[PDB]
Amino acid sequence: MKAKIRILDMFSGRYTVLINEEDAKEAKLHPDDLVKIEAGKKAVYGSVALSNLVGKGEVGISRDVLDLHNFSEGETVSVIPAGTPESVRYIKKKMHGEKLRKVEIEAIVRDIVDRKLRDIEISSFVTALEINGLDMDEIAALTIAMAETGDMLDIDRKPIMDVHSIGGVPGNKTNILVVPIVAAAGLTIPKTSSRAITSAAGTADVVEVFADVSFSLDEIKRIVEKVGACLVWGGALNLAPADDITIKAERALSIDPTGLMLASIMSKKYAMGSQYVLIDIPTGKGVKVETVEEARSLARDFIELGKRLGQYVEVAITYGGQPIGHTVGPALEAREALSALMTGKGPGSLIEKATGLAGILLEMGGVAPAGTGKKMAKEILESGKAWEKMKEIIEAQGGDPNIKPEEIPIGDKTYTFTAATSGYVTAIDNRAITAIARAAGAPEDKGAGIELYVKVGEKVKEGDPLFTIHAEHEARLDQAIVLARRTEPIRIE
Amino acid sequence: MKAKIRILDMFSGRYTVLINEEDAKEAKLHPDDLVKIEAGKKAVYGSVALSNLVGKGEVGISRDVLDLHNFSEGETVSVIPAGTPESVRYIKKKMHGEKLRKVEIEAIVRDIVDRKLRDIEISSFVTALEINGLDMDEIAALTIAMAETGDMLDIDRKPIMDVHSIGGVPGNKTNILVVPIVAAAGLTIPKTSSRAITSAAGTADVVEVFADVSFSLDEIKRIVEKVGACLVWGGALNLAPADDITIKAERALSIDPTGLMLASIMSKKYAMGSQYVLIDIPTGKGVKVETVEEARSLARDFIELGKRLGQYVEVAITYGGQPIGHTVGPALEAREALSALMTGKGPGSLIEKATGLAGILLEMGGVAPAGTGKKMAKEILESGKAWEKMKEIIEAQGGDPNIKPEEIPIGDKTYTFTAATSGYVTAIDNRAITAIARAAGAPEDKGAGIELYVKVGEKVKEGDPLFTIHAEHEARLDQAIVLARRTEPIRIE
Numbered sequence A, B: 001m002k003a004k005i006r007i008l009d010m011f012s013g014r015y016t017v018l019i020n021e022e023d024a025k026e027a028k029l030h031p032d033d034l035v036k037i038e039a040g041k042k043a044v045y046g047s048v049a050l051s052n053l054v055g056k057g058e059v060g061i062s063r064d065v066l067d068l069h070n071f072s073e074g075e076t077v078s079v080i081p082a083g084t085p086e087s088v089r090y091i092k093k094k095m096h097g098e099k100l101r102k103v104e105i106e107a108i109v110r111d112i113v114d115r116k117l118r119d120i121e122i123s124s125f126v127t128a129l130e131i132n133g134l135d136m137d138e139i140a141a142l143t144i145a146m147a148e149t150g151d152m153l154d155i156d157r158k159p160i161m162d163v164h165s166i167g168g169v170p171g172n173k174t175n176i177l178v179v180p181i182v183a184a185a186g187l188t189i190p191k192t193s194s195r196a197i198t199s200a201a202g203t204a205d206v207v208e209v210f211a212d213v214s215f216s217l218d219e220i221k222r223i224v225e226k227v228g229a230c231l232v233w234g235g236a237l238n239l240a241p242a243d244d245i246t247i248k249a250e251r252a253l254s255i256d257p258t259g260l261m262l263a264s265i266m267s268k269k270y271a272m273g274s275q276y277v278l279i280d281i282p283t284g285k286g287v288k289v290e291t292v293e294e295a296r297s298l299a300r301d302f303i304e305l306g307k308r309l310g311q312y313v314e315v316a317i318t319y320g321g322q323p324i325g326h327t328v329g330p331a332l333e334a335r336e337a338l339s340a341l342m343t344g345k346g347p348g349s350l351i352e353k354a355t356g357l358a359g360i361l362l363e364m365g366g367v368a369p370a371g372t373g374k375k376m377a378k379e380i381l382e383s384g385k386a387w388e389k390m391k392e393i394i395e396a397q398g399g400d401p402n403i404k405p406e407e408i409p410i411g412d413k414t415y416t417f418t419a420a421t422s423g424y425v426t427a428i429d430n431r432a433i434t435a436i437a438r439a440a441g442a443p444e445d446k447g448a449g450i451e452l453y454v455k456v457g458e459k460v461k462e463g464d465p466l467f468t469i470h471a472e473h474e475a476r477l478d479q480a481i482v483l484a485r486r487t488e489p490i491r492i493e
């Protein structure tokens, strides 16, 4: 079917091709059919939609197509039905429990970037990975292929330092402190973060509260070269594009398969040119890694994988048993991160973790002598040096450097739980806490989340507030409250 | 968020809700977000697409939504973001290899029919089932829930007979013969069939060549009551509606998970009201069941499942080692089935299988004394009685009762493979044959397929025709030739 391109103003989150109903009938095209649209060299894969929105001889392409392609309005194109990708066969092999060849893995990823493989296929591959897993060879191959399928950042500074968390632990806004501290010491730390996957707020969600996080790689180079650091969303750019698509399936299913997770973090690091990388693994009940043996094993994977990519990797196994700091959800976490930086003061759990992580990086970067990195990190934070650096990052990223953290808006609707009985907190359930924060509307509603007044081992008297739920909407707040009652996230002995 | 309905002539194969960009920003709505559209009783779950096609305060819904939901233009509606469905947790529990409780299974089915769970979740569920499976309790729970989810056909005749094949074997147009034969005997047989899953052609695809296959339940009742039988597409009607949604993922991935398969076939039989059910299990190399012992196990599952539904189930374990008859793909298969009915003459593999299955049903039906059913079926075929019944079914289904089978168009692009050496055919690879036929464009191109000239144990001379490939498009033919050349489906010794 040959047609003239019309650009339709809609974003479905997929490549949408609008086909004339008469034209579609003539061409035997059905809704959600996979088609290829080509003119000369240029080609795109889209999902068919039938409508009268498009005139005869007219094909409509959604705005999504525009970003990675170059199709002009009225340009003549050929629309041809596209067959099931050969790569589905490879997805089926993984499903059966078979190890994938490098060439097979390469085929799947390119298919993902190409959009030949769609939600059903991608979800199937992710589910297969979750149930059947990957060995180190598959992961290394997956990581490299993911990285190779995108652009690579070029930064004139070296060496390039990086920090990443596998997350899971609630309220982990820690790296927001860490980057300004490392950059303040003069090291180069261009950080990329995903949005929430299994949690209430991903770091990008938190940063987005006070600054833009979506940039082009060119924009990223300029910011990092001028400021020495960035806190940006990995998704927004053509860095490991396969990863952005794969994460969406993971987010929907509330899963983060370890082999995929390793490939996802490391592929972005390789794309960014990171040489010295620090990985944080929250460990404990309610998180991705329950035990230290599990954490150590995971640490070895990160280290072996980095070695294969030519990267120096160090891992910190940290306590993930409870939420970090006092906040869950994007605005609340942002307020906590910003105030801690600006005043140099904040919750012990956040400050100690952040200084320790930054300290490892400072030593790795060679700016701190062995064993003095954590102390140096504290001085940088306390002196307001990290704050000055953060102001620069925020200004470079379209934020207001004069922002007042306590003035950042949080959810209008609130309900506070109080201690039923006098006692001491014996546990906080991380999974329950995340679920409640999500019920409140996080992270889509930045204001939504939980403020936590208690931590484990702390004595409490009856009527002492345990936590407050924040929500933009009353319906969301009520759902969170209902969930909170069933869950009993805070346990008092 | 409150909005007013605008019905748009768009069909995406999914429930897509168009949201104004300014409105989306206010409501924190992003592409592919799930939203619930509510009026009073009226409820629908849709996938958000941001567009400048609709004004502020307007939500655009595809006219598709109107089929099962009575929305009207300009109606005030509530648009609220839907949280991740609770059933996703159950899907996740399945990924972890856990046994699903009845409530968990019921919740998944409610969510599928509600369109609450979309392609990602459904694909994840099908994949998880494929890797981890279901036990009998779960399958029984799945079957009842799927049946209960939809309407029940009321036919004023009893007993109701049905036949179903698990398929897998290529060229299984066999039940096309069986239904007219059983009906000719005055028995009531309202057959439903799926389109292709793992095969080149589903029975529905084959029947569609000569007659309409999509009908309302009211239409099915009218045809079956008048004619006593039907050959229709199961997908088109609200019987076990969940099954139709899951099959799409199954078709895309080319998998038919066994527990899902049992629940799918049996739920439809139960919804239809079938009391006596004959299940055909093709057994052999290149098909879903490799061995007889495996077939007997699957047979036991079908029988026990039927007992739970209060149905009498009989199972025929047939030979699936090679393609039935001489054709693969929808038009070719139709020509072979219609010709066999019309002349009473056709390939031995098809006629013998069809009469044998029809015979079991005739005996079950009480129309034939024990052990005479196959003979009776052959008499019905040879006398033209089956053909007269088929002409009735066809007329009732909107087809031409007077069509000539020889005249049905088939793909005009052909290539014939010939014997490289002299010898005897020792094997035919079903998996290769289905793949080649699919490469040819089957079933989407009805003309596409394979005509098979040889069968196992047959002596061949170098240069004897082995099979011919049919395609409607040159490119499709060329890809098929390539596969066939690499594949070498026919083994000569």
Ligand SMILES: Nc1ncnc2c1ncn2[C@@H]1O[C@H](COP(=O)(O)O)[C@@H](O)[C@H]1O
Binding pocket: A165, A166, A167, A168, A169, A192, A193, A194, A195, A196, A197, A198, A199, A200, A201, A202, A203, A204, A256, A260, A261, A262, A264, A265
């Ligand atoms: N597979 C992954 N890919 C990218 N980032 C991840 C991944 N897993 C965890 N993260 C980081 O941890 C947070 C998301 O994980 P979660 O806490 O499970 O939502 C984000 O801030 C990410 O930067």
Ligand SMILES: Nc1ncnc2c1ncn2[C@@H]1O[C@H](COP(=O)(O)O)[C@@H](O)[C@H]1O
Binding pocket: B165, B166, B167, B168, B169, B192, B193, B194, B195, B196, B197, B198, B199, B200, B201, B202, B203, B204, B256, B260, B261, B262, B264, B265
């Ligand atoms: N799970 C299933 N649901 C419905 N029909 C099926 C199923 N499995 C096999 N069939 C029948 O077998 C054919 C499709 O399976 P396949 O042979 O794998 O394409 C159709 O003619 C169906 O009626």
